[PDB]
Amino acid sequence: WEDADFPILCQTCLGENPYIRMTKEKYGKECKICARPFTVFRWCPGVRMRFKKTEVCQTCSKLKNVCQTCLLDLEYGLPIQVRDAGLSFKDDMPKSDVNKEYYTQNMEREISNSDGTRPVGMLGKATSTSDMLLKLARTTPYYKRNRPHICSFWVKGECKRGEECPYRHEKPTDPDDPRYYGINDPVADKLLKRASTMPRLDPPEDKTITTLYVGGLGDTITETDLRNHFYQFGEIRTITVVQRQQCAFIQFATRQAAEVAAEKSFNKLIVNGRRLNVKWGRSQAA
Amino acid sequence: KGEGDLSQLSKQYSSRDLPSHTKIKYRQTTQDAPEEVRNRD
Amino acid sequence: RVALEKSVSQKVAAAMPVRAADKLAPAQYIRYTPSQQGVAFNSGAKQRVIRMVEMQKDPMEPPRFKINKKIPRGPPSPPAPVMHSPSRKMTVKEQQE
Amino acid sequence: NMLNLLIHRKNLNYLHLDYNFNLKPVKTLTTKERKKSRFGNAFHLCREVLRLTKLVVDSHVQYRLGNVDAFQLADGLQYIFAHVGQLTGMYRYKYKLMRQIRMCKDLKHLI
Amino acid sequence: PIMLLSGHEGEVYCCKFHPNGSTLASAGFDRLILLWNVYGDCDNYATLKGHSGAVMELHYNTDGSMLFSASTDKTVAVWDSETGERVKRLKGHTSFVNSCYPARRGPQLVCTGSDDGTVKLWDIRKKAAIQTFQNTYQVLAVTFNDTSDQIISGGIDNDIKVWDLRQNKLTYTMRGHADSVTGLSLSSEGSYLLSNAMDNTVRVWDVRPFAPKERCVKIFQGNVHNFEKNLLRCSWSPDGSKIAAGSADRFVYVWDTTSRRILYKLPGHAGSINEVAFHPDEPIIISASSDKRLYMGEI
Amino acid sequence: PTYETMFAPEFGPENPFRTQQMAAPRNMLSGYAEPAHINDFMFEQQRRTFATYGYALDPSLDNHQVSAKYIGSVEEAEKNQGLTVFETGQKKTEKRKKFKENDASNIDGFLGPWAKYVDEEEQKELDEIT
Amino acid sequence: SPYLFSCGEDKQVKCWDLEYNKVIRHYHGHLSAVYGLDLHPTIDVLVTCSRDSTARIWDVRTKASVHTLSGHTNAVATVRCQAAEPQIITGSHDTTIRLWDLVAGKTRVTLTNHKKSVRAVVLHPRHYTFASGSPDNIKQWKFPDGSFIQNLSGHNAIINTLTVNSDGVLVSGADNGTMHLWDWRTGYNFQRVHAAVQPGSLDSESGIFACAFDQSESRLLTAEADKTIKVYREDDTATEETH
Amino acid sequence: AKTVTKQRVESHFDLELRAAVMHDILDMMPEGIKQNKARTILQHLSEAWRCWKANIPWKVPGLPTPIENMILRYVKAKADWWTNTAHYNRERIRRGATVDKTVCKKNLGRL
Amino acid sequence: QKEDMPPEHVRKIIRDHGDMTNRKFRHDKRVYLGALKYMPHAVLKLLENMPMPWEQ
RNA sequence: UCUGGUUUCUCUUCAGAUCGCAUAAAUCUUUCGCCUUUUACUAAAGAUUUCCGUGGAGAGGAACAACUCU
RNA sequence: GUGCUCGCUUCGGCAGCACAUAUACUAAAAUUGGAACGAUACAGAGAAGAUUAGCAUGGCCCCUGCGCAAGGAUGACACGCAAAUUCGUGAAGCG
RNA sequence: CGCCGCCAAGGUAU
Ligand SMILES: [Mg+2]
Ligand SMILES: [Mg+2]
Ligand SMILES: [Mg+2]
Ligand SMILES: [Zn+2]
Ligand SMILES: [Zn+2]
Ligand SMILES: [Zn+2]
């Protein structure tokens, strides 16, 4: 039912080698979600690494901008649930077999035969990105995804091969922390990790820190851009720009709006292509 | 790209569907061939 | 004619392919630029030419996947405007006729 | 190993297909297992031609056991090639070979 | 304008300019020969198809009517530049054809050389080899003198050899390279022959009835060969004033045939350069490389 | 054809409304792919070179327009001075001597290419896991 | 080719050889009954319109369905195909016509008129502007891009057949026995002739289900619902002038 | 699909006849809001055939002329097929072609 | 360039497989049913080369 | 004195010769004979294929290729 | 690793030449969802009286069968929607 | 002058 020429293949599954050899089939395995006969391709990424043939088909990868074999996004290198939780639009897809699954899957394959270049619904909302998901976007990822799965007979001590067993050895797995939408167990801990980062400890008073020491101005930040980026938060009382240290001083009437600026600018407010420097003001008349 | 059951999705090598009469007899010049049709009254 | 001829040749070499066809000569490479992530991903991956061969399908295999699925027919081509003549209504008596 | 594994895949477990290629039910079959387990011409005719070559190879391995000579095997597989239908039941699911049985049964007299 | 051309899916190994300066020919690892408009919008027209091996060398005859193509499949094809139809297949060598040249002036002749160590003279009308010169080491580059009396062959013995068509004898040997010779080319006068070699030496040799007898007329430097082991070819400018030779270091080197100063070093290529050609009338340089793109440098 | 036509850049602010991935050129949703006819031998040679020692040259056409460098593990290229896997090296270091028995006459003593080499608390945790 | 094709409601399309008067191919694969069929004038393909929803392409020398044309919601009455683009014209019982693409299999254009369903289309064969046929306000069309050229007069009977001559005369055969002549230059009804019944038939049984000219187009002949073929010739008079 | 064999002759001709009269009365009735009460003209056609089989003259009042005379010509076409099959299988069971109990016990009532 | 091998290969393979009542070889047994289609192509070529009684 | 090649293994299309000194089955369209409906059928003709094999031709090797036809 | 060549000065050391990167990687799996059949208990069997030959239509139901034969209880599932006749409400318009 | 050599679905429901 499905033929292909080349799969999606994000970089963490290609391997460390730009020179890999790959064999192909015409009708290979079924997808583990919808059982569609795609074309499984097989290659060797590394010398200590398993083959990682193919998990899903091309069509289900073209719905949500997903790679081919490890089920992560191509645009970041993240799972699907983090992506549509950060963008707050799920682009729903059924769960059963013959109820509504293959119906809308065949129709979305039928309407996407022209382009084959972009996903069906994420083309308009993958543009307003790089704000909340750029904070965890791992460059040069760990190659432990590519290492082979654990073998038996070393857990029981029966392995006659010894060192020439190609899979792994001396790796005790843990039965406490290991599909398409939900639910994923370590991903909940990853959302707890991004919800429990390392900010500055909030001093115990009643919102008196309305000043803020922001610097790194140079020639990109100007006064009108900064006061219009503060104007969407609210109104000023006394603002200034100092150029001997390349810094700006802003305050607010009732602190809370600038408080989310404190949520916005903990090495996080990225305007004009620069990681700005932010530390605390005095708020003490010192 | 996903045709019907006749194309690839079946090994039903069915009866009555065989390469029988795999050559077409053409109407030659002694019959009412279209070359003699294009000029007769 | 050549379009339907190559279509029916693929059909005959797909519906009845049983009699002695060679597979392919897969000596071609494919060169695909990693233009999605690479700035330090696999340092030096700039256009990444790879090798593509084909696995031999042995002729001792039944069809592996159950072709028995049946779904209702989906939405067709979208309806064009209908543009008939102005619709008339006759009487109260000819409708009774 | 294929004619028994067809039965093992189709979840029967009551047709005792034996090495001399026959077929026997065992359990006095009810309606839901009689109609599931009956074969057409493709299974049965292959079973009879495999029984024929089974008897031929049994004749040859009986010769190479070392208790029977060449003339006796000659008359033996002459009787095998001349008296099918009497001992193989291959005409039952394909009648066209019956004339060929007669084509054997005539030429034997010529011999 | 610089002009950037693309099309070749694999490495380009050679390119030439039509004798009248109206069109270009290019070919390489793909097995396709592309024709290009020199002027206009630099358009691409016919693709010549039929080579099963890679195209090692293109040449035009002096009339610009016949295009010759040496391939790794042991066959040298003759192409009609006007229609794009194939004329003949010179089937002969037992191994790869490394290079071919077509005699100008005198009745049509073609020379080939291959990894079987032989050099063969072909008459396009016979469908059979005319002469065979067994060397003993693989032959990489071959050219005729303008009198059509001599064959000049460069191999991997670091020694350019000259063959007499009438005597069928090793007439001359040239010493002066420390490594394999990858490309030979005669001046338009017949006066001088230009050589590239792994040793990174570009050497001009003068061939004359009266020769000094130690014909290392000139030496130039800058052209680098490396681990890729690409055949390297060099060309004479239309008036013999400039010498171009490609290199593996991404630079087009053009020298002054007299003072030996580097006139041009040009970048723009990403990979190794396999051939540099000069337009027959105007100061235009076609640079062909392994990055599958061509440039039209103008001086 | 003219080099100036393809060399002429696009007047614009690069359109940063899209991201870096989606604004990049492609034809498949993942990279611009096109077939070619590269030689097999040098391809597999530099593949085995990167598989053994981790350095190889960098194949492209139009990334920087000047590229002759090595990729992967950098220092091991100049440590071995750019050798290949098909070339006899300058030294024979860390070589590993086996034993041979190729008379093919003895019983249970013939060990040729099928020979084994001369050299030839976790269980409590693995019990507590299972 | 020296053979003919036939088809009917027995779910069978028979290829009747004429050198031996026998069936040689016996096309099958239609899930319902068969209404009409047509041949391509140049190449060895055939088009067939059936009862369920589809028209299908039968390849001669292969007898395999190359394309199934599935875009209708009712039966398809008649089908014509030619050498010039567009190829296939299918008029169906869901009150629409559509012109197909024979290569890709998808439709080119759909044509929505005719409150009562279309049952007759025909090629002329000299120049463009093919015609359609329906019980209500019989129309006229065009080969490129679609174009409503003209509608004809009040031929309000339920019709079955259209046949057209190269010199400009056209004939429409209906279900009430009334067959009507037209012209190609204007759209003028000329004769308005009705056929009487041969003795066995009753008063209202006559319905024209087939009509065709000669290859000289000097003789017309119709097959009616009274199990009779009626053959018309010309009239060598002069006093039949147009008002 | 499946072909029409000798058993699905009378179970296919009636289906094609009701489909033909269906798409004929769907394309002959005028622009009123109701077509046929979804089965009634079929019932009049069937009752006209049953009344022709008993030769009841079938004079129903208050009925439009085109639907009733198209029902008359349709039951006349079914009568022509019925009698032309009756003559044919009567000649076949006369000369001895078929020995079918269904055909003979049907042809008794069909004469 | 493929040629003969020792004939004790097929015997070892089938004495390993046997009557296919084990769970180790379950990936291969369907292939045995895939050998169902071409069995008369083997039985025909078998019975074409039967040893004559002057042979051993 | 020069000229200088039989077997075996792989693709390559054409076949009109008892392609094979012999001869299998199936499909369609008809006539029959058993027959209740059908698949299994009977046995004659007409026309197609399938299948076990075969004929001559382009190349690449290897097998004593150097014995030697020329 | 192996063979050949004194090729470079010891049979030994070195150098060159030739051979040139397989594997649904497992004997396992913490294992994975487990549909058929059989057993338990229900419900029960077409055609306006009874016993019932059947052939059909549909698609998100299958099985036996080589099936464009056939048979599976007519193989099973097929049910109340009245439409225009009377009256009320609301809307569009006309005198 | 010497035809002819028989299986199954059709029934113990799903
Ligand atoms: Mg029945
Ligand atoms: Mg039934
Ligand atoms: Mg039923
Ligand atoms: Zn999928
Ligand atoms: Zn992946
Ligand atoms: Zn292990």
d(CA E239, CA E172) in angstroms, rounded, equals 27
Tell how strand C49-54 and strand A21-24 pair up: parallel
Q: Is F68 on the interface with E (CB under 8 A)?
A: yes
Which one, of D29, D26, D23, D31, lies nearest residue D7 by Cα? Answer: D23
In sequence order, the β-bridge partners of residue E252 are: E266
**Taking CB atoms and an 8 Å cutoff, what residues of chain G touch H13?**
9
Report if CB D32 to strand L is under 7 Å: yes
Chain centroid offset of residue H95 CA: 28
| HSE toward the beta carbon, residue C66, CA cutoff 13 A | 5
**Which residues pair with residue A247 across a beta bridge?**
A215, A242
Question: Which two three-digit tokens encode residue A271?
Answer: 């305007």
- Count Cα neighbours of A90 within 13 Å in the Cβ-side half-sphere: 7
Tell me which ligand sits closest to the C-alpha of residue A12.
Answer: 5
For G168-231, give the DSSP string: SEEEEEESSSEEEEEESSS------EEPPPPTTS-SS---EEEEEE-SSSS-EEEEETTS-EEE
Measured torsion, CA atoms of residues E60, E66, E72, E75, in degrees rounded to the nearest 10: -150
Q: Which domain holds residue E157?
A: 1-299
Cα D41 to Cα G204: distance, rounded to the nearest angstrom: 57
Q: Chains with 3 or more CB pairs closer than 8 angstroms to G?
A: B, C, H
Q: How far is the CA of F112 from the centre of ligand 1 (A)?
A: 74
Distance CA G60, CA G47 (A): 11
Report how far apart, in Å, the C-alpha atoms of D31 and of each of D9, D12, D24 are: 20, 13, 17
| Residue B12 CB in 7 A reach of strand J | no
Torsion of CA B2, B7, B10, B16, to 10 degrees: 150
CB-nearest to G61 from B4, B6, B24 is B24
Sole residue written with tokens 């400018």:
E237
Q: How far is it, in rounded angstroms, from Cα G50 to Cα G35?
A: 5
| Partner-chain contact D1 I53, CB within 8 Å | no
In whole angstroms, give the CA distance from residue E102 to residue E112.
Answer: 9
Report the distance from CA of residue D42 to the C1' of nucleotide K49 in Å, as an integer: 50
DSSP type of residue G46: E
Q: Which nucleotide's C1' is closest to D38 (Cα)?
A: K64
Instruction: Starting at the earlier edge strand, list the strands of the sheet with E86-91.
Output: E55-60, E66-71, E75-80, E86-91
Which chain C residues touch F21 with a CB distance below 8 Å? 36-37
Interchain touch G–D (≥3 Cβ pairs closer than 8 Å):
no
Between CA D36 and C1' K62 the distance (Å) reads 12
Mind giving me the DSSP string for A225-251? HHHHHHHTT---S--EEETTTTEEE--
CA C73 to the chain's CA centroid? 17
Ligand 6 centre distance from Cα of residue A156 (Å): 10
* Secondary structure letter of residue F14 according to DSSP: -
I48 CA, J53 C1': separation in Å? 12
- Least Cα distance to G188 among G240, G226, G122, G110 occurs for G240
Experimental method: cryo-EM
Strand order in the sheet with G96-100: G76-81, G88-92, G96-100, G107-112
CA of B12 to nearest chain A CA: how many angstroms apart?
17
H/E stretch holding B35 reads helix B34-37
Q: Which two tokens stand for residue F104?
A: 């093919």
CA of A32 to C1' of K32 (A): 12
Mutation pick from H6, H8, H16, H27 vs chain G, by most beta carbons of G within 10 Å, is: H27
E215: domain CATH number?
2.130.10.10
Q: How many Å apart are CA D61 and CA D66, to the nearest integer?
A: 9
At A240, phi and psi to the nearest 5? -150, 165
In 3D, which of D38, C64, D6, D22 has the Cα closest to residue I33?
A: D6
Q: How far is the CA of H18 from the centre of ligand 3 (A)?
A: 20
**AA identity, residue E98:** N
- CA within 13 Å, CB half, F43: 21
Does any CB of chain G come closer than 8 Å to the CB of residue B11? no
Q: Which nucleotides of J are covered by protein (CB under 7 A)?
A: 12, 24-30, 33, 35-38, 40-43, 46-53, 60-61
Experimental resolution (Å): 4.5
D32 touches strand K (CB under 7 A): yes
Q: Which of H11, H7, H75, H10 is nearest to H41 (CA)?
A: H75
| DSSP classification of residue A145 | G
Residue of E212, E210, E207, E185 lying closest to E196 (CA atoms): E185
How far apart are the CA of B16 and the centre of ligand 3, in A? 27
- Is A174's CB less than 7 Å from nucleic acid strand K? no
Angle at CA A251, nearest 5°, toward A248 and A257? 115
Between chains, do B10 and C14 touch, taking CB under 8 Å as contact?
no
Cβ contact (<8 Å) for D1 and I20? Answer: yes
Closest in B6, B20, B24 to G60, CB measured: B24
Beta-bridge partner residues of E104? none
**CA H102 – ligand 3 centroid, Å:** 20
**E17 token code pair:** 């300019």
CA distance A203 to A212: 14
d(CA E226, CA E121): 32
Nearest nucleotide to A48 by CA–C1' distance?
K25
F93 touches strand K (CB under 7 A): no
- Smallest Cα–Cα separation from G27: which of G10, G51, G44? G10
Contact E158, E171 (CB under 8 A): no
The dihedral built from the CA positions of residue A197, A199, A201 and A204, taken in this order, carries a sign that is negative
**Residue F84: its chain A contacts at CB < 8 A?**
none
Which contiguous run of DSSP H or E holds residue E201?
strand E201-206
Cβ–Cβ under 8 Å, residues E235 and E277: yes
Beta strands G169-174 and G178-183 are: antiparallel
Q: How many CA atoms lie within 13 A of H99 on its CB side?
A: 0
CB atoms within 10 A of CB G228: 14
Residues 4-23 of chain A with CB under 7 A from strand K are 21
User: What residues of chain B lie within 8 A of the CB of G44, using their CB?
Assistant: 24
The CA–CA distances, whole Å, from E121 to E106, E108, E133, E207, G240 equal: 14, 11, 9, 20, 89
Determine contact, residues A80/A180, Cβ cutoff 8 Å: yes
Which of E144, E142, E132, E60 minimizes the C-alpha distance to E106? E144
Calpha distance H106→H9 (Å, rounded): 14
F126 CB and strand K closer than 7 A? no
Nearest to E231 by CA among E243, E211, E217, E248: E248
Tokens of A173: 């797995």
Report the number of distinct structural domains present in chain E: 1
Residues 30-89 of D with CB under 7 A from strand J: 41
Please give the radius of gyration of chain G, using alpha carbons only, rounded to the nearest integer: 18
H18 by DSSP, 3-state: which?
A: helix
Is A167 within 7 A of strand K by CB distance?
yes
CA distances, H54 to each of D11, E160, H11, H70 (Å): 57, 114, 21, 20
* Token output for E160: 């350019």
Which residues, in sequence order, are bridge partners of residue A212? A280
A–C CB contacts, 8 A cutoff, strictly below: 75
Distance of alpha carbon A153 from alpha carbon A161, whole angstroms: 10
Contacts of E101 (CB under 8 A, 6+ apart): E59, E110, E111, E142, E143, E144
H77 touches strand K (CB under 7 A): no
The secondary structure of chain G in percent helix, strand, coil, rounded to multiples of 5, reads 0, 40, 60
I36 to chain C: closest CA residue: C60
| Per-residue flag: A179 CB under 7 A of strand K | no
Q: Which residue of A has its CA nearest to F16?
A: A127
3-class secondary-structure state, position A102: helix
Interface test with H, best of G14, G72, G160, G204 (most H CBs within 10 A): G204
